[PDB]
Amino acid sequence: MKLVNFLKKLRNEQVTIELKNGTTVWGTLQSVSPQMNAILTDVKLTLQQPTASDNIANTIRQIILPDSLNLDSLLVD
Amino acid sequence: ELEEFEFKHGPMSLINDAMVTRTPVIISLRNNHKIIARVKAFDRHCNMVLENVKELWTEKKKNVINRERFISKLFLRGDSVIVVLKTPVE
Amino acid sequence: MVSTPELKKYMDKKILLNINGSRKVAGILRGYDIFLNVVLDDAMEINANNHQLGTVIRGNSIISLEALDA
Amino acid sequence: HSSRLANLIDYKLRVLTQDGRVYIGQLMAFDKHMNLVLNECIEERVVEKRVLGLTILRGEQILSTVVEDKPLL
Amino acid sequence: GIPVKLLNEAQGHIVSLELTTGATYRGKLVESEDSMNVQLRDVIATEPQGAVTHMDQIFVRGSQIKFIVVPDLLKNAPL
Amino acid sequence: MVPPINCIFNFLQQQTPVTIWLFEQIGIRIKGKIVGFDEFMNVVIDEAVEIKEDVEKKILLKGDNITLITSA
RNA sequence: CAUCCGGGUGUUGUCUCCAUAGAAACAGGUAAAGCUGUCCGUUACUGUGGGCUUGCCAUAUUUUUUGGAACUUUUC
Numbered sequence A: 001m002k003l004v005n006f007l008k009k010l011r012n013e014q015v016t017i018e019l020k021n022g023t024t025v026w027g028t029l030q031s032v033s034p035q036m037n038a039i040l041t042d043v044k045l046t047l048q049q050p051t052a053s054d055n056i057a058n059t060i061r062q063i064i065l066p067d068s069l070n071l072d073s074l075l076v077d
Numbered sequence B: 001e002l003e004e005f006e007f008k009h010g011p012m013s014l015i016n017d018a019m020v021t022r023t024p025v026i027i028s029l030r031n032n033h034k035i036i037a038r039v040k041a042f043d044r045h046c047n048m049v050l051e052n053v054k055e056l057w058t059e060k061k062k063n064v065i066n067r068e069r070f071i072s073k074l075f076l077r078g079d080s081v082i083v084v085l086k087t088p089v090e
Numbered sequence C: 001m002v003s004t005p006e007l008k009k010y011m012d013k014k015i016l017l018n019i020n021g022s023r024k025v026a027g028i029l030r031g032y033d034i035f036l037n038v039v040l041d042d043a044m045e046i047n048a049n050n051h052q053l054g055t056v057i058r059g060n061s062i063i064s065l066e067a068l069d070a
Numbered sequence D: 001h002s003s004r005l006a007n008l009i010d011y012k013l014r015v016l017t018q019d020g021r022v023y024i025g026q027l028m029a030f031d032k033h034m035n036l037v038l039n040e041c042i043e044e045r046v047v048e049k050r051v052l053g054l055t056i057l058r059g060e061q062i063l064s065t066v067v068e069d070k071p072l073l
Numbered sequence E: 001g002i003p004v005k006l007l008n009e010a011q012g013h014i015v016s017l018e019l020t021t022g023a024t025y026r027g028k029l030v031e032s033e034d035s036m037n038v039q040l041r042d043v044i045a046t047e048p049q050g051a052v053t054h055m056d057q058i059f060v061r062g063s064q065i066k067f068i069v070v071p072d073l074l075k076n077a078p079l
Numbered sequence F: 001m002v003p004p005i006n007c008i009f010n011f012l013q014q015q016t017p018v019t020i021w022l023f024e025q026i027g028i029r030i031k032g033k034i035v036g037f038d039e040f041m042n043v044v045i046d047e048a049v050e051i052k053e054d055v056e057k058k059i060l061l062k063g064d065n066i067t068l069i070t071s072a
Numbered sequence G: 001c002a003u004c005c006g007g008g009u010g011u012u013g014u015c016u017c018c019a020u021a022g023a024a025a026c027a028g029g030u031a032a033a034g035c036u037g038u039c040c041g042u043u044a045c046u047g048u049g050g051g052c053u054u055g056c057c058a059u060a061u062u063u064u065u066u067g068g069a070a071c072u073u074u075u076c
Helices: B003-009 B013-020 D003-007 E002-009 F004-013
Strands: A014-019 A024-031 A039-046 A051-053 A060-065 B024-029 B034-041 B048-056 B070-076 B081-085 C014-019 C023-032 C038-046 D012-017 D022-030 D036-039 D054-057 D062-064 D067-069 E014-019 E024-032 E038-046 E052-059 E065-070 F018-022 F033-037 F043-046 F059-061 F066-071
Touching: B003 B013, B013 B034, C014 C038, D012 D036, D022 D054, D022 E002, D036 E002, D054 E002, E002 E024, E002 E065, E024 E052, F004 F033, F004 F066
Parallel strands: none
Antiparallel strands: A014 A024, A014 A060, A024 A039, A039 A051, A060 B070, B024 B034, B024 B081, B034 B048, B048 B070, C014 C023, C023 C038, D012 D022, D012 D062, D012 D067, D022 D036, D036 D054, D054 E065, E014 E024, E014 E065, E024 E038, E038 E052, F018 F066, F033 F043, F043 F059
16 A cells, blocks of 8 residues: 555666755666665766766655656556 | 545545546645646655656856756655645646 | 663752753753653753743753763 | 665675765674664765774665675685 | 664773764763663763863763764674 | 653643743744643644744644743 | 403495486595596576575654755855
8 A cells, every 4th residue: 555566666777866965866776675775786876976886775855767667557556 | 444534535635636637736845846747646655656747946056047847757755745736727 | 662761860969951052951850751851940041141940841852961069 | 675785794885874974894784774884984074084993873874875895705 | 683782782882973963972881772872971072163071971862873983892793 | 750741731730821942943932821732742822922022922833843841 | 460251333345125317437546535627417597386594574743764854155
């Protein structure tokens, strides 16, 4: 009975994440937890100049999802 | 148990009402950057999946500059939301 | 949870509290709480102008609690 | 869950905090609150450095995690 | 959880810490908690300014702690 | 000894005037008599006043914003 | 001090009953052995079938994960 469960389906796609801190993060998602803690693969995060990180992982403001992803199919259990 | 009861009667019902009506919404954020879009799905924490979003936010360089950007799909964590305005087209 | 703190040794003794907003208070320790809410009697502000009052300080606020005399 | 978090154990990590400071060192112990314990730590406030030793961070304070190097033998 | 037990094990030794306040405190630790409360003695504070002071007894709230700094032998401890 | 919620229970019966301080705002304070409260420390003040000493004139407060509750 | 009736352990050569892959193939040495090198059986990445060493088991209202944040300005 949570919208979090939908994010566990999301795995594999790339997203630019914004945080409360005010950073921006392009990278592929590997896994998503019930407590929102996401782990990313092949990341390019910017705080300062942008710096690439391999394995990046409360602070999440919003995910800007890719345009190809069908919402109707994922919103079902 | 009691969560089912409040979705029909309470404050959150007007999103369920609006989002089912295929409605657009104006949302005031905690970032000082308002969000104007149409909603897909919501939750008890106000975790909302938005579609076709457009922001409105001032700036300085200096004088006030407004800037807009279109986003296709957007999962918003309800902590960032401070005020929701559920405005109908009709 | 709710570890009732070790303030038994401060009961009925003078104190020098500090609180949020850099404001501080002297008083006789009457009673304490789970959340560290405090009861002080003979409460005197420390602005340096010291005003007598006669007080329940909130737990959240508290930064610390001292002893004037050993 | 926490299956991914055990995989990080005993790797040199780069941890950004809410203050902006960034701690670095191996990971010995981990929590459900994301309390991290770190060995032989070094902050980089920014052209700066400091030596601390064993550091136990809270969950509130932590922002992001990132592996610097592979697990040491 | 282990991140709390390590703390309880450094009771007696001298500890350094950082609060949301911005200041760091250093002293012998007497009691801790699962909340992350603390009880210390002979504390030597040092704020953002550099201002040193002395505090005889102190209690804390964990919520207010950012992070601790613990003695070196506490890395061979059992997990 | 005196626990904290039993202390606030006395302020209801006596109808004593009590000034309330806010969390992150020293510039502002409040006043009023206490009718009722709850487990989460929300308060229903009566004849409440906003206090330069600019006294501006029944409300309810959230328990997250309080710091001090003081008699008279 | 001996003698005698006994025991277990290792190792070697046999005997009886029983087992099915095979890569049990090659070359090095000790007091010993895949001890070593090569080597081969499944196989290192999938889906069906078994077991667990696992999720630790589900908290938006004060000590961590549903925010006191947001914003501005001056100094070097």
